[model samples]
Target chain A: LRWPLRFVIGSSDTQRSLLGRIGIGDVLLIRTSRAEVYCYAKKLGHFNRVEGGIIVETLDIQ
Target chain B: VDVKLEFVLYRKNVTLAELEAMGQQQLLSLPTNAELNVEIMANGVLLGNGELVQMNDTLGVEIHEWL
Candidate 1:
């Protein structure tokens, strides 16, 4: 089973709208192209794809 | 700084029926056998891609490209 909560980094309006629910230090599960893992929020950067989809820098605990 | 590296094996969307059908099966078939891309995520940004390697009982990813 996965965590009850997770965050998806996306460009769509629905994904962007969910950002308001996130806060720094919030631990979350993120699914990438290949794997799904959980991490702790570390930093929140700007919306630059070059920075790799809005930065929600996390501390990978798993 | 300490960082976490994730080795991505496969990804896809499946319908509820498809998911429910997967009972007790441990493996999900992939679309292709081509090299898998390991996504490196720090915080939220995708750092890049790589290939996964297994050593004994541990797993690790070897980066091949950067984004």
Candidate 2:
């Protein structure tokens, strides 16, 4: 989206797994303007923990 | 707020290594292409495919819509 992190939704499990292996934790930078447009309808990407369910973390713009 | 469609596109289904092989050439030329393919999920569902274009400085999506 912005920087540091890259939020990408894969077409298949393989792609999803590959992206997951990148070790990209929840961060703000994965945001892109286009991605932002899509995010308007739903909550942005976040970690799905058993207890928390979801959370919006910060990103590094610079 | 009339959102109509979603499009998801990918190069091909392959391992990270297989994907890398095909991607390396483009990667060296324009690394941005690696993140080229995207899945447009709306309201928590998968969509279709599209491309990115730079409008002046800001970037935008060139979505491929269905007829």
Candidate 3:
């Protein structure tokens, strides 16, 4: 992704909690050419690409 | 409040064999000069979009649109 976000494993405690609630298939780890990292939740919502990369949303976890 | 954003540069779909065959050299060949989309997300919600940029040795992004 271009405007990438950094998501190192164990970077935040709250993130781990959210990750635990999702199914294994919902998570995605993306790496960019610039070495930027991103964590994506595909099972949460649909993504539409407006230009640079796909846009996504988080689903309400039960 | 703290917010999280996931910037997507680009995507390349590959098969299992293609994935397994990938090596450092092949990975290094991937293009980085292309202009790509930058999606902004917050708590799993899409907040906006932008473009990738370079600032010295760091990578940055410029906002193109807001959600």
Candidate 4:
């Protein structure tokens, strides 16, 4: 499932390692294209994929 | 090709004065992928491309046609 949430990351850190390899930024505000503005997310404690899944959140702007 | 001239329903209760007062018209996002059935209506009637016009620092609709 997909969810949107506001998080403050460093200007040198990125969600994707590929982006980091390309010398992206740490603190960046990006939307997973066509994603709801603000939603909720939680870390999935059962996976080693390094990404978390969003649960029980809806778009703030319909 | 002249086909059947079926009467289509338009928006209702809007007067000419209101239409005249509405200076300009604007459309949001044009449909893509050959979707040509785009029509913005006034009082439920088909109007022209509603564009954004200036009216005392605000915007309004411009009706380019009635038929």
Candidates' DockQ values? 0.04, 0.04, 0.05, 0.01
Q: Which ten residues in a row have the lowest lDDT in candidate 4 chain B?
A: B2-11
Q: Model 3's DockQ?
A: 0.05
Off by over 4 Å in 3: A1-62, B27-33, B41-47, B54-58
Which wins on TM-score, candidate 1 or candidate 2? 1
List, residue by residue over B1-67, the lDDT tens digit for candidate 2.
3333332222122334422342232221213443344445443444434554456655434444311
lDDT of 2 by residue, A1-62 (tens): 21122233322222333322322121112123322212234333332112311122331112
Clashing pairs in 3: A1-B8, A1-B9, A2-B8, A2-B9, A3-B7, A4-B7, A52-B36, A52-B37, A53-B37, A58-B44
Local accuracy of candidate 3 as per-residue lDDT tens digits, A1-62: 12223221111112444432433222222222322333344222223323433333332222
Task: Rank the candidate models, highest TM-score first.
Answer: 1, 3, 2, 4
- lDDT of every predicted structure (CA atoms): 0.35, 0.31, 0.37, 0.22
Q: Candidate 3 chain B — worst ten consecutive residues by lDDT sum?
A: B22-31
Model 1 Cα lDDT, one tens digit per residue, B1-67 = 3343333333334444433343223234433432345444544456455555555454445555665
Candidate 1 residue lDDT tens string, A31-56: 22222323234221211112222222
What value does the TM-score of chain B take for model 4?
A: 0.26
Error in Å for residue B12 of model 4: 22
Which CAPRI tier for candidate 4? incorrect
lDDT of 4 by residue, B1-67 (tens): 2111111111123233422222122111222411112122222223233222235433232322333
Q: Each model's TM-score?
A: 0.38, 0.30, 0.37, 0.19
Top DockQ: which candidate number? 3
